[PDB]
Amino acid sequence: KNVVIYADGVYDMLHLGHMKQLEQAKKLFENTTLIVGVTSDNETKLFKGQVVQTLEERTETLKHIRWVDEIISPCPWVVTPEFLEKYKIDYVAHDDIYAWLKRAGKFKATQRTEGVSTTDLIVRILKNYED
Amino acid sequence: KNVVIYADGVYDMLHLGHMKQLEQAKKLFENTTLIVGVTSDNETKLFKGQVVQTLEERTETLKHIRWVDEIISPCPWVVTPEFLEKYKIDYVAHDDIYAWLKRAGKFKATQRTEGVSTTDLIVRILKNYED
């Protein structure tokens, strides 16, 4: 009855938005193991262009999140069928190169969620000191 | 055998430092319930001078933290003996007005911990754009 869910991401500067998305992934079924993949520094820089927190920092922060059952750190940039087999993953939780997951019935959407980001915080603070 | 631990705080702009301190409080004994008190907006403003996130935001973020078992939101600014009785609290986890807790054997220190704060993040980011 236990279902293994995989969610990967950069998880840079984690905020409530990320936490809620992890919660949603964890609750896709009644009994789950939520495995979270955390992307490497070098691949995040190459493919997204930048990253603020190191792999160690981003992983150590996720360890404190209630919904996270297991972490793969670093994770592969691109999910493969062999990877799903190796970790007995039943579903991939995502926000096409993803058509193969949908054809296999392994694709689960999570909807992005609002959070108070670092940027939101700075803007809120600075609003008290200048227009 | 289960021991009830109480930790209060503002928990504004929660970061790894806070998470580690919650972890320490939660692990003071083998079997615990960690109750976290979250201070009100108005009392935090009056007594500390400011607060960035609302009570709702600060509480909703703590809900996602693995170590948090129960939340009192808002909590009293000052712990009283009656409060400990009402919530069956065995120990208060803190970082004197606190002499009474120590005389009762209910005081447990947690050591402040390093984290990557919002401020640390902004400084790290800006270092790439100016000296």
Automatic annotation (TrEMBL), chains A, B:
It comes from the Eukaryota. CMP binds at V10, Y11, H18, D95, T113. Phosphocholine binds at V10, K48. Residues 6-122 form the Cytidyltransferase-like domain. Belongs to the cytidylyltransferase family. This is choline-phosphate cytidylyltransferase.
